[PDB]
Every structure is written in C-alpha cells, then in structure tokens.
Structure 1
Amino acid sequence: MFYGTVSSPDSGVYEMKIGSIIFQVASGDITKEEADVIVNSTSNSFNLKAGVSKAILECAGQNVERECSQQAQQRKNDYIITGGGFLRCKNIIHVIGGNDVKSSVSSVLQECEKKNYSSICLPAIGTGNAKQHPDKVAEAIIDAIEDFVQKGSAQSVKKVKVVIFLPQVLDVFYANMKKREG
C-alpha cells in the first residue's frame, strides 16, 4: 500500500519510497551530514556526552550545550529543539534514547512539518547508552514514518535518512527494508 523498491543510489547507501517520502540508510559519521534537522539521541537531562551524543555536542558547540541545559531546567521535556550551532542544519532535535522510539520519531516528523522542512537525518535512536535492541529500533523508526504517511501528514517532508555508527546495525535496517518492500 505504501512501500516501493529497495535500491542502492551510491555505494553503501540503500533507499526506498514510503508513500511520497524517500527513506535512506547508510553507515558513517552523522556530524558530517547536511539536512534541515539533525536528531541527537541523549539522556533525560539533555547533557550526555557519550557515543553519538559526544560527537553531536562537541561539533555543535558550547552555545548549543548552553541552550540544552537552560531548557532542561525550565520544564520537564520529552524532547528539546535548539539551533544547529556549527553543524550543517537549521535545528537539532534532541530526543531521549530510552523513550519509546516510534513516539520520538513521530514527534520529530510533526515538528519538521510545523517548520516546512524537507530533510531529516537521524542516528539509530536508542542503540547507544540506552541499549535498546537494533531490530526493535529499526521496526519502530520505519513504523513511525508509515503512520505519518497513512494519516496524510507528509506535505513538506520529502527525505528521511538514518546514518548509523556500526555497519552491523546497518545490516539490521537493510533487512527490515527488504521485509517491507513492494
């Protein structure tokens, strides 16, 4: 009803259509990517500096770190939106790695529509310090995008890319795409 065909547009990159959205996966360093939004997978205090969160906060810079701690003390947040700092993006959305991954991705998609953004890049949310299982994380990410498409909510959002630290986790995402393809 929604899924296109899995193919490889460049070496190590795999893509398929989900409704109107191009969904892509690749292994690499997320801090070198360009997108309207980059997603950080962090702790409930928004000040973790381990694994992918270390790279994102170090590259983004101290003003973004400052933004995070200030919003954390203002209220209880399920996620926080900051500037991009020295990353190549318009905003960073910082989600909690231990939270429900489908819910976190659904929130990212809705916030990107609110800003009329077209591109998103995210890590394998929850597979770092939170130690959620890669198979469940892949299923949750793709389920969130399917639901967003099914509800007719995709308007500005055109491209969602997962850039993944470990090649072994990329294999799990590829297998999930092949399970779903038309």
Structure 2
Amino acid sequence: FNAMVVNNLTLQIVQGHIEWQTADVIVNSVNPHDITVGPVAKSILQQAGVEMKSEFLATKAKQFQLVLVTKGFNLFCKYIYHVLWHSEFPKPQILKHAMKECLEKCIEQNITSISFPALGTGNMEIKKETAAEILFDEVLTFAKDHVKHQLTVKFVIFPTDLEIYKAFSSEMAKRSKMLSLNNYSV
C-alpha cells in the first residue's frame, strides 16, 4: 500500500512535503498566469526562492505547452516540471496529457527519479479517486511502453491530507492485485 515495482519502474506513495523532496525532478502545479497560489505552488516557490519565478516568466514569455521546465534553484532537484492548468481544457484531460508529457520528458533527459504531488486532487477539481485512477493509468502505461528506462516515481501527499493519502494507497492496492509486482515481506 506504499510502494510497488512493475518492470523497470518503482512507484512509491509518500506522506511529506513535495518542496522538501530529493529527486532528479520535482513537479509543480500552477495557474499559468500566476504561480504564487496553491499549497504546492506556494511551497515550491518559497523553497526554491524567487529566481525560480524569474526563470518561469522568462521561459513563459519566450513561449516554451502543458509542462514548462525550469531549474530547481534551492530545491534538491535538477529540474522542476511546472504543470500548467490551462482553463480551456477539461481537468481530467489536462492531467492525463500532462502526466504523459512529464514521463516522456523523463526519457528525453535520462531522468531516473521524479516526484509528483497529488496532481489534480486540488479542491473540487477532480474526485480524489479519479485523479489517482488516472495518475496510475499513466505510470503503468509508461512502464509497459518504456521498459528500457529505469525510473522511480513518487507521489508525495501532504501529511495532513489523510483522505488523499487513503485514495492513493487504496488505488495502488487494487492495481497490484492485478499485476505481478516484485513486493515481499519478512
């Protein structure tokens, strides 16, 4: 209920702060017009510092798009993948496609570990169970399709959000019932 392995991919569920993560890539969630708002966005901006914002605006104005990439500044990561929640598209669709785009960028950069927050869960954005359903659909699809790329994928739930943590645990549990899984016990 906290970690499984499928082919060349490890998937972990973690209670903690995304902005205090150590990974190749940490994943932000933002309004494209304003990245100073939201639990994740706020925490990642505070932690990384204000120069991450300068770069964001430079790369936006230049026009780099569901995912925009910056460096990590004061995060313990190399890159940040800022997921851009454009209002013009249905929120389950943005999630689906943004997840695909995040994992494809992983292969494009020999990224070996990437940490996501509970994307989509937001507030009245997407039913907790659906967001987890979708997140796991993408991670598993990638694992089947990209078996030669070793990758650790974390979902970091904020310690207070016990219900989101529960949805995610519960979702993994179901998926394992339906999979080989290199999981053991001692």
% identity of equivalent residues: 30
Call closer, same or farther: CA 1:154–1:65 in 2, change over 3 Å: farther
Distance 1:71 1:159, change over 3 A: same
Conservation of the 8 A alpha-carbon contact between 1:46 and 1:94 = no
Q: Which runs of 5+ in 1 are unaligned?
A: 1-5, 7-13
Q: What does residue 147 of structure 1 align with? A: 141
Q: Give the aligned residue type for 2:131.
A: V
Instruction: Tell me how many residue pairs correspond in the alignment.
Output: 169
Residue of structure 1 equivalent to 2:129: 135
Aligned partner of 1:80: which letter?
Answer: L
Q: Describe the shift of the 1:85–1:76 C-alpha distance in structure 2 as closer, same or farther (beyond 3 A).
A: closer
Structure 1 vs Structure 2 CA RMSD? 1.8
Look up the SS of the partner of 2:32 in the other structure.
coil
Return 5+ residue gaps in structure 2 as ranges: 86-90, 180-186
CA distance in structure 2 between the aligned counterparts of 1:162 and 1:41, rounded to whole angstroms: 13
2:70 maps to amino acid: T
- Give the aligned residue type for 1:23: L
Task: Give the CA deviation at 1:130.
Answer: 6.9
| TM-fit CA distance, 1:65 | 0.4
Task: Report SS of the residue matched to 2:11.
Answer: strand
SS at match of 1:169: helix
Q: Does 1:63 pair with 2:34? A: no
What is the TM-score normalised by the length of structure 1? 0.85
TM-score by length of 2: 0.84
> Residue 92 in 1 paired to residue 80 in 2?
yes
Q: Structure 1 residues 88 and 76, CA, compared in 2 at 3 Å: closer, same or farther?
A: closer
Q: For 1:119-177, what per-residue CA distance to the aligned partner results, in whole angstroms no more than 9, with x for missing partners?
A: 010100122257222111101111111211222x2434421010012121010011111
Deviations 1:85-113, CA, capped at 9 Å, x for gaps: 10000000000244621211111111111
